[PDB]
Paper text:
Fatty acid synthase (FASN) catalyzes the de novo synthesis of palmitate, a 16-carbon chain fatty acid that is the primary precursor of lipid metabolism and an important intracellular signaling molecule.
The isolated modifying region of hFASN produced via the TEV cleavage method demonstrated adequate orientation distribution to enable 3-dimensional reconstruction of a cryoEM map of the complex into which an atomic model for the core modifying region was built. CryoEM analysis of the modifying region revealed an arch shaped homodimer composed of two of each of the DH, ΨME, ΨKR, ER, and KR domains while lacking density for the C-terminal ACP & TE domains. Many residues within the ΨME and ΨKR domains lacked defined side chain densities, although backbone density was clearly defined. This observation suggested the presence of significant conformational dynamics within the two pseudo domains at the periphery of the hFASN core modifying region.
Residue numbers in the entry:
A (entry chain E): 858 to 1122, 1410 to 2071, 2079 to 2112
B (entry chain F): 1689 to 1793
C (entry chain F): 907 to 958
The structure:
């Protein structure tokens, strides 16, 4: 009966390809793997082959993800109920996959006819190649191997492409799902959990396959999100539902972060590197020719203080003969113009030679070197008036901190938006779920960035005019200030306090929308409320008792029963039942005469929901404000609708996407309830804003009654304060950029260029100028640029070369055309590798054009005509810090960049040089290096955010093995 | 049509299509789909831009009922007029309610 | 059986099995323990479905 499948991932095993299905460092069994395993079981039951068995899957539900270990095997048991057409895949007795599987009795080829695209594709020549597609997917968290890299070509929108057929159904349908999720605006690891239907007809799949000039069979795939289908070959996946699986915090990327700082302490051959034509390189090769007399090689640069021969020496030491030549730099890096300027023809050179140090740098009278120190692990805390509460590590209440908000670095002023100082912010159930990790941030409607914190849905405080207001926000309510439309604000009455009013908006808006707008509750209607002692429960009780409705409330303890009795004296002893059990249903049906309750405001889950459905009377209204059964697609027997029953799915969040007159109805209802005294503030347990973590855990334990409120600011005694400015508090520094400023990324069309541009967009950048020599070539670049442009960002792709001073001037002018230049990023790079022997001065010139001369010109033009510049960042390499074989010119250019940044920072202007190691998932090293793994790009962006708020001139980020 | 609404009528014949077109000139060629198969769903999902319909007056059953449910937009109203699926207690996936959908028996 | 308290849930009877005067009716009971479900069939035709 139960077909056993011992999935083994060994090399000799036939299922070794499953090793290539990696999702965030874990080998997961694909959902299409379950589809194929059930297909095999059904073919065996019917005595057919999979290639001869057109099959239909329906209501496929994935209940857990199977971990395929590196060593060992996993047994999956498939059981078929042929009479009910159902199947069941289980692992070690635990249900894994459920659904209906049945042979397609009448396979219709017309089903696998690709739907017409909603709009024609204009960028037909520019498509996403296989490498680009899977680099993007790896950025999203799918570390797919070659076996599952079946997408050879895909359109920019992700609505069409071609899938490579390797005679493997698992890989084919997995790449089908990859194509479906490729054009997904949501970011993160999205794994399928439900599929409505999957029709596989191998007969027409063979016909649909066609072969390219590579002699590889491919199938055209079309993803129609309008129809919510994916059609490829003879596979049709309709109603695919994917949920965002959180990425495990057990990431091996624990980067080493360091600071690069100046630290005071035969026949000699002098090599002057001060020449700008690099003609000395050949002479340096001559120095490498000798062996005995080459021991005292003194490589000195005395003209330019930003020579940057540090990386040159560090890399040349790694090359053969460098240690024997003892190549050591004598760099006169005087940060200030008023400097001693030690003469290298005096006794100072003799003392330096006697010391025989590996490096000698003269810094304002200090004879030292450049050294790496461990960066302090303490996050940079700054005093700001605009901060929000965020969980630094998801699912950990201990890592709850105040971090700087986007409002302080970017102050917006426009009609229809109001910046309100927050004195009190009420923690909600969704906030606890977000902080504890039980709720995915992507589940909340709205365009939220990856680094966005959505804690807080409710606040009270003072608006810009100083009026005492209380507001309902989609997210970010746990902030010292919020930016919300005035349509979501209510005036706090004089008799109320800000602490009292902080509990009203979310709870009473939810109750009013459920009961009046949706439930249409009439006076005198018997009504059941689940979790009556809770906020929404209490508001529903107040609204129902305002209408004189008989109320049955479910509570979880005797203390909550007593509190509800005291708070609402209209409730008798027969109005209370148990919410932790199902018995409430009997109670209700005993006290309503078996008729039922006209309305059921239900926030309970699983069978407690179904019992609440059983409590419904004829013409009953079931308002489901809970989410567990809604998110799980749990079955609901529709025979209840034989009672003329209405079933409302009440979500208040849908009011933050349109905010039309439908929300204005709820706003008017809440205002009328406030005026009439129906809306009464709940009991508030107040925790000081300096300690939000204890509030979070206290409300998580669930013994709280009413509302839990964090006091961001104590309410001063007054009616309308003219100032109403938030008080200064210490918060973790976070990099944000004004929307009115333009930012330049040199080489922003490159890999790290595009990723940093996206990160800046997520940090509030609205004006971007990415400069590249060749313009837009690859499909990935075009897709990213057009996505940012559709997002509303002013992205300019310029061809101005920062190598030439005129080019840098034109680039800065183009940026200033968009807006004042707030930041310049130097990521432009050309690589001319090779040992010192097979190295030419022209290669040095080419490698230093973007980095050395480019940073010269950027610094000069920013000094001349960028008074308001906030960021001057350049990307150097750890090859400068320590040394790389065959990359002497790269190290020299990086060291020159670092010297430029150090001089800029010493003078007072912004300056930052980031010594990046191997860069993962994106870059040049992807299109173990020097003992360092490629740092994943998310970690790179986190480290860059850390570095951008540091006072150190040069910092390095690299991951050891 | 009195309320000036966009209407998608599912009929199972071409003669029914012609009679509906003659009776209600406000209906266009895109207003008609097929009631004898699930296909109408796609038709609706094509002509609503994937948004779906605000109200479903469903008298069909089984897979046609499920397809009609899948046609609901956000804040959609599903008015069950038929009784087969109601009488048989057929399970209804409780995830359409995540679109602020109200189900009317 | 007498040592096993049991719970049936959502039991549905799709058709009635007529026991012949002479002969025998074969009833197939299949259990999905992980799904906690059961199925009773007569000749491959679904007769009873539910959870147990
Ligand atoms: N659909 C929508 O738009 C909205 C939905 N909601 C949902 O409505 C539900 C109720 O809202 P709300 O009253 O504010 O939630 P609350 O924390 O205020 O209380 C909800 C009830 O959940 C019960 N509960 C049981 N165990 C726990 C626990 N471990 N932690 C916390 N509570 C527990 C408690 O009641 P008891 O012990 O007596 O059973 C608690 O009173 C929430 O789940 C919330 O997510 C809220 C706002 C809007
Ligand atoms: N990726 C990595 O592993 C590491 C990267 N870094 C730093 O990361 C930064 C980004 O490099 P990378 O990740 O490799 O991205 P890419 O190397 O893929 O992109 C390099 C970009 O440099 C552009 N470029 C070079 N010179 C100029 C110029 N004079 N004007 C305009 N554009 C220019 C090139 O433009 P065009 O399109 O015309 O070629 C190219 O697009 C570099 O500064 C690099 O030093 C540091 C250490 C490691
Ligand atoms: N719940 C309630 O309150 C009420 C419900 N109803 C329900 O409305 C539904 C339809 O009622 P109503 O529209 O008046 O019926 P009609 O006789 O006027 O036609 C019903 C439609 O159903 C289709 N149909 C499918 N099979 C048949 C069949 N064997 N004979 C005739 N027509 C068929 C036809 O459309 P097509 O063939 O093109 O598919 C037909 O046009 C019924 O299920 C009925 O139970 C009616 C009154 C009240």
């Amino acid at each position: 009966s139960a077909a056993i499948y011992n999935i083994d991932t060994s090399s000799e095993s036939p299922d070794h390809y499953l090793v290539d299905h990696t999702l965030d460092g874990r080998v997961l069994f694909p959902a299409t793997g379950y589809l194929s395993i059930v297909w095999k079981t059904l073919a065996r039951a019917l005595g057919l082959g999979v290639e001869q068995l057109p099959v239909v899957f329906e209501d496929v539900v994935l209940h857990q993800a199977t971990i395929l270990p590196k060593t060992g095997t996993v047994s999956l048991e498939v059981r078929l109920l042929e009479a009910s057409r159902a199947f069941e895949v289980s692992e070690n007795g635990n249900l894994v996959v459920s659904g209906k599987v049945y042979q397609w009795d009448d396979p219709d080829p017309r089903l696998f006819d690709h739907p017409e695209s909603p709009t024609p594709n204009p960028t037909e020549p520019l498509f996403l190649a296989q490498a680009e597609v899977y680099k993007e997917l790896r950025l999203r968290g799918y570390d797919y191997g070659p076996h599952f890299q079946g997408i050879l070509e895909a359109s920019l929108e992700g609505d069409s492409g071609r899938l490579l057929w390797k005679d493997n159904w698992v890989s084919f349908m997995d790449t089908m799902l990859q194509m479906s999720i490729l054009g997904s605006a949501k970011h993160g690891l999205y794994l399928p959990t439900r599929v409505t239907a999957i029709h596989i007809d191998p007969a027409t799949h063979r016909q649909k396959l066609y072969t390219l000039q590579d002699k590889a069979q491919v199938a055209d795939v079309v993803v129609s999100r309008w129809l919510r289908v994916t059609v490829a070959g003879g596979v049709h996946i309709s109603g695919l539902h994917t949920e965002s699986a959180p990425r495990r915090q057990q990431e091996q990327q624990v980067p080493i972060l360091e600071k690069f700082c100046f630290t005071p302490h035969d026949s000699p051959i002098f090599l002057p590197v001060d020449d700008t034509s690099f003609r000395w390189v050949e002479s340096l090769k001559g120095i490498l020719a000798d062996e005995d007399s080459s021991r005292p090689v003194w490589l000195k640069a005395i003209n330019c203080a930003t020579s940057g021969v540090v990386g040159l020496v560090n890399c040349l030491r790694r090359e053969p003969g460098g240690n024997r030549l003892r190549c050591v730099l004598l760099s006169n890096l005087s940060s200030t113009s008023h400097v001693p300027e030690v003469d290298p023809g005096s006794a100072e050179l003799q003392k330096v030679l006697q010391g025989d140090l590996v490096m000698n740098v003269y810094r304002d009278g200090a004879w030292g070197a450049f050294r790496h120190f461990l960066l302090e692990e303490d996050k940079p805390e700054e005093p700001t008036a605009h901060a929000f509460v965020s969980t630094l590590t998801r699912g950990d209440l201990s890592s709850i901190r105040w971090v700087c908000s986007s409002l302080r670095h970017a102050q917006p002023t426009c009609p229809g938006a109001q910046l309100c100082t927050v004195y009190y912010a009420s923690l909600n159930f969704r906030d606890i779920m977000l902080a504890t990790g039980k709720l995915s941030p992507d589940a909340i409607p709205g365009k939220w960035t990856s680094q966005d914190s959505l804690l807080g849905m409710e606040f009270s405080g003072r608006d810009a005019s100083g009026k005492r207001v209380m507001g309902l926000v989609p997210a970010k309510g746990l902030a010292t200030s919020v930016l919300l439309s005035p349509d979501f604000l209510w005036d706090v009455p004089s008799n109320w306090t800000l602490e009292e009013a902080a509990s009203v908006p979310v709870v009473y808006s939810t109750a009013y929308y459920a009961l009046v707008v949706r439930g249409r509750v009439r006076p005198g209607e018997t009504l059941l409320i689940h979790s009556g002692s809770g906020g929404v429960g209490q508001a529903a009780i107040a609204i129902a008792l305002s209408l004189g409705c008989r109320v049955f409330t479910t509570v979880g303890s005797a203390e909550k029963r007593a509190y509800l009795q005291a708070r609402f004296p209209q409730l008798d002893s027969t109005s209370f039942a148990n919410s932790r059990d199902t018995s409430f249903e009997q109670h209700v049906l005993w006290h309503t005469g078996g008729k039922g309750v006209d309305l059921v405001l239900n926030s309970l889950a699983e069978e407690k929901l179904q019992a609440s459905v059983r409590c419904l009377a004829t013409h009953g209204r079931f308002l489901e404000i809970g989410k567990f059964d809604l998110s799980q697609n749990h079955p609901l027997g529709m025979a209840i609708f034989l009672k003329n029953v209405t079933f409302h799915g009440v979500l208040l969040d849908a009011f933050f996407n349109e905010s039309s007159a439908d929300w204005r109805e709820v706003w008017a209802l809440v205002q009328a309830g406030i005026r009439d005294g129906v809306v009464r503030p709940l009991k508030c347990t107040v925790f000081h804003g300096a300690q939000v973590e204890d509030a979070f855990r206290y409300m998580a334990q669930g013994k709280h009654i009413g509302k839990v409120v964090v006091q961001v600011l104590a309410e001063e005694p007054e009616a309308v304060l003219k100032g109403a400015k938030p008080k200064l508090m210490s918060a973790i520094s976070k990099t944000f950029c004004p929307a009115h400023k333009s930012y330049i990324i040199a080489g922003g069309l490159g890999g790290f260029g595009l990723e940093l541009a996206q990160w800046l967009i997520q940090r509030g950048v609205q004006k971007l100028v990415l400069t590249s020599r060749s313009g837009i070539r690859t499909g990935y670049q075009a897709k990213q640029v057009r996505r940012w442009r559709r997002q509303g960002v002013q992205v300019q792709v310029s061809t101005s070369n920062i190598s030439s001073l005129e080019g840098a001037r034109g680039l800065i002018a183009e940026a200033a055309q968009l807006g004042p230049v707030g930041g310049v990023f130097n990521l432009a790079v050309v690589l001319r590798d090779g040992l010192l022997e097979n190295q030419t001065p022209e290669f040095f010139q080419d490698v230093c054009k973007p980095k050395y001369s480019g940073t010269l010109n950027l610094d000069r033009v920013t000094r001349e005509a960028c008074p308001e510049l906030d960021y001057f960042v350049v990307f150097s390499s750890v090859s400068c810090g320590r040394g790389n074989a065959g990359q002497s010119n790269y190290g020299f250019a990086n060291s020159a960049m670092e010297r430029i940044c150090e001089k800029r920072r010493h003078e007072g202007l912004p300056g930052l040089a980031v010594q990046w190691g191997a860069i993962g998932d994106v870059g040049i090293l992807v299109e173990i290096v020097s003992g360092t793994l490629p740092q994943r790009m998310a970690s790179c962006l986190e480290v860059l955010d850390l570095f951008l708020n540091q006072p150190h001139m040069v910092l390095s980020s690299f991951v050891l093995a």
